[PDB]
Amino acid sequence: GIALGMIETRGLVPAIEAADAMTKAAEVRLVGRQFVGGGYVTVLVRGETGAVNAAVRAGADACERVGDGLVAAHIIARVHSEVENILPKAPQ
Amino acid sequence: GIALGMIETRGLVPAIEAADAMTKAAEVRLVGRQFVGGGYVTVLVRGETGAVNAAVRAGADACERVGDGLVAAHIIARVHSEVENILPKAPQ
Amino acid sequence: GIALGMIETRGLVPAIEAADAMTKAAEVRLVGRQFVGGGYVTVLVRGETGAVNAAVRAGADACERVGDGLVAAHIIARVHSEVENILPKAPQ
Amino acid sequence: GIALGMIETRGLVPAIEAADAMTKAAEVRLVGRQFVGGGYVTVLVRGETGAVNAAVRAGADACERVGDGLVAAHIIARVHSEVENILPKAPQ
Amino acid sequence: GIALGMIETRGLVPAIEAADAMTKAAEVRLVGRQFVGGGYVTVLVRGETGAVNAAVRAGADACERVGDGLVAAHIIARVHSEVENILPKAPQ
Amino acid sequence: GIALGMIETRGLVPAIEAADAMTKAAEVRLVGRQFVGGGYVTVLVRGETGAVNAAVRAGADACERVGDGLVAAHIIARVHSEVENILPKAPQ
Amino acid sequence: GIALGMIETRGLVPAIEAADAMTKAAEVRLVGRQFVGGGYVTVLVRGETGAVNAAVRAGADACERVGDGLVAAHIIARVHSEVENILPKAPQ
Amino acid sequence: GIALGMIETRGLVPAIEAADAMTKAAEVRLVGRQFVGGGYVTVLVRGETGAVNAAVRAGADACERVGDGLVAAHIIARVHSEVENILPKAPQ
Amino acid sequence: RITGPGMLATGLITGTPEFRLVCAPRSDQMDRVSGEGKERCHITGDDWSVNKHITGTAGQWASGRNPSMRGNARVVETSAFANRNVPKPEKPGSKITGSSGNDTQGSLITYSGGARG
Amino acid sequence: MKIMQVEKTLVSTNRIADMGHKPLLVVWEKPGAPRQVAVDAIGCIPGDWVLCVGSSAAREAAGSKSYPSDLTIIGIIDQWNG
């Protein structure tokens, strides 16, 4: 799935809630959950463009009132080929 | 039971208190404790829906006034299988 | 003794101090020191209920004027067997 | 092209957005993303000086409103060889 | 020498300054530099009580105005044997 | 030489820039870059006293307006041999 | 994908911008650029439906303020085979 | 050079003026003069980024008061590779 | 009506189907029992402290057992600490000349007969 | 000012409060020469050739016009062979 969706949260619990809502919502593959530093967590999903759009809308709505909340909900439909190197391929 | 219960706290003490209170309250298993960055700790429990409901509420009440406190007390009855990849199974 | 006593600090120096004070104040076994993230440090002790009660009061008093100080002083008298998995056994 | 362009963000999402934007805006190669501690993330590009200039200006406009936003956009036209040892060569 | 001296700083530069000043001031062994999390850095020295007292007094004064500053300057003349396990033996 | 120059910044970009202004300004070797926690980054140089002096002045002027800026700019002419063990030797 | 994204502009510059922007935005292929008469210029992109929505939204926003700007931003998610004959296949 | 500069004019005379200005100002190749329809004339330059920036600034200032004047001055530092197929390579 | 864990943490839980200084300043507090019996620091959890509902070991439970009466005896302490401000006569001065180590600013030294040394 | 080599650290736990938290070093002009104690205002290591100020100048160099030092190290000599 070319598309990329990212959700960033303050704390892991909203990240989990966002991940779950993203993946229930549409055919998007979770490729990463990142502990960024300072309490930031980022969840990354790949998929087809509309599936990503729907998944990031859901995620954002799901995590917003959970814990410390949502920092960023973002969609990149087609990431530059260079960006792919800094993108997680499977969650670790 | 596949229900997930999650407590996030500012600091480890409220987290240990939360975990203790949860597992004492209900038939739930403790699956992880995660250090997120910035002082967030997340405690995670698995079990059947009601048990997780009772547990998370017990942990929340228990650790609210402990240390720097509670950040999130959250439940997901059934996580998407994609999210199982970012969830710890046993606490190591 | 299976009671847990826990001190959480802002910085390691207050933690080491809490630790020394607790171990000198009562017959408690220091079982851990945890770096939690964001500057929080937690010291964990084990022993009998009275001993723990005494140790945590000593740690708290001693570390409070040291550095950035004390976040939490807490006791779990009887610890659920499940929590033991997230509890450090011997400090390393 | 050996100039270095760097963007630092608060969180991974502005960083990814900056990187996408930079590679898309100009003839720059992405060489790194670094989690710095505390929520800071840095994206580093390499290239001809003007390209790096166009790229960093675009990465800055692109990330400033994403999440917690931008911290730094900087360019260094000729990196002293000593600095090359602390610079990531290709992205992980 | 079995006494302990510890300096905690906000940032690493004041930590090196404190460590250098301690080691210069008296016959203490530097046994550890710990990155606590959150920008806290601690420096630990070990030696005879008088040496340690002098070393810490000197380091505290030396790093107080360096960078973000001193957090704590503490001396433990007699260390409980339990606390030895949590204390570094050699600087890493 | 054995002089040590150190810059500590809030963020990595001011640090690279400091490292770069420092090694261009004077004959100093960059022996290290260190992620301290919380956003602090330290860059460390070594050389003869005059050179370190000139490097720390140049690096400090250069990074001050970059990003979250500068935290500390410090020099030690003759580093104690105990401190050498907590010092990076090659940047890596 | 067989979806068609089309952008119409007043003048070539906005069209080029539209084309660049659409291709950068999403996984779409540029299939043509057509001069229409009167200064109208048309760019066309083919690809999967969501990718084309994303591409045309970007293209529209990108050319609107460029020169004489945007005339039309349209999408067809399935093109009839008869229309395929009057559609440019590969650009130039 | 990869960068693209484009000037669009109402009429041919401002285009010729822009072209002369652009090529005098910086090292950029004139790759295309295009009769769009309706009287729009587009001039196209390729070169390095800074060279293109300066050429387009020079071109735009020069032709603004010539004839019916200026429509667009636009710069794309790196076009997507597909957009290359719709760009002229030498002027006809 | 129904009690148990469902009644806890109301308003804290999310995800539910419905949703879908530690130590008290040293100047202000003086401890009843000092040492390991101190109460200035708040200890959370299963500590040995007793709440309002609890009755029985100390208090009236210790103090009411044995009858006592207090007198109003005449009390005036006779001690070195009590005598610290005792009236003293005029301090002696030294009128001597000649080099004699004649400091007048230090602690009072006396000689035979009460003289300033 | 005199040029001296730092030999070792010196520690006095009972010293007067006016010395503050200042470090003290044993310095001599040469190995085997008479030993003097200098306040270390710079941060010197054993074997260093240092420059030492005496008298009233020592007091201010050690932090105050009222400091108890009659000998303060004021700089390390970049290059000295003794």
Residue numbers in the entry:
A (entry chain D), B (entry chain A), C (entry chain F), D (entry chain C), E (entry chain B), F (entry chain E), ...: 6 to 97
I (entry chain X): 712 to 731, 773 to 869
J (entry chain v): 1 to 82
Sentences from the paper on this structure:
Among diverse BMCs, carboxysomes are specific CO2-fixing BMCs found in all cyanobacteria and many proteobacteria. The carboxysome uses a polyhedral protein shell to encapsulate the key CO2 fixation enzymes, ribulose-1,5-bisphosphate carboxylase/oxygenase (Rubisco) and carbonic anhydrase (CA). Carboxysome shells are typically composed of three groups of structural components that form hexamers, pentamers, and trimers. Here, we generated recombinant α-carboxysome shells of Halothiobacillus neapolitanus by expressing all the shell proteins (involving three CsoS1 hexameric proteins and two CsoS4 pentameric proteins), together with the C-terminal domain of CsoS2 (CsoS2-C) that mediates shell assembly.
The cryo-EM structures of T = 9, T = 9 Q = 12, T = 13, T = 16, and T = 19 shell assemblies were determined at 2.3-, 2.99-, 2.93-, 2.75-, and 3.04-Å resolution, respectively. The resulting T = 9 shell atomic models closely resemble the T = 9 mini-shell, with root mean square deviations (RMSDs) of 0.33 Å over 928 Ca atoms. The T = 9 shell has a minimum of four different interfaces, whereas the T = 19 shell has a maximum of 10 different interfaces. In the T = 13 shell, only F3 (Arg712-Arg731), F4 (Arg701-His732), and F5 (Leu773-Gly869) were identified, whereas only F4 (Arg712-Arg731) and F5 (Leu773-Gly869) were determined in the T = 9 shell. Intriguingly, the smaller T = 9 shells involved only one conformation of CsoS2-C, whereas the second conformation of CsoS2 appeared in the larger T = 13, T = 16, and T = 19 shells. From the current density maps, shell pentamers were all assigned to CsoS4A, although CsoS4B was detected in the midi-shell samples via mass spectrometry. Therefore, all structural models of the midi-shells were built using the sequences from CsoS1A and CsoS4A for hexamers and pentamers, respectively, which are highly conserved across α-cyanobacteria and some proteobacteria. Fortunately, the density maps for the T = 9 (C1) and T = 16 (C1) shells were retained at good resolution. In contrast, the T = 9 (C1) shell map did not display any additional densities, suggesting that the CsoS1A/B heterohexamers are likely absent in the smaller T = 9 shells. Nevertheless, we cannot exclude the possibility that the possible loss of CsoS1B signals in the T = 9 (C1) density map may be ascribed to particle superposition, instead of symmetry-related signal suppression.
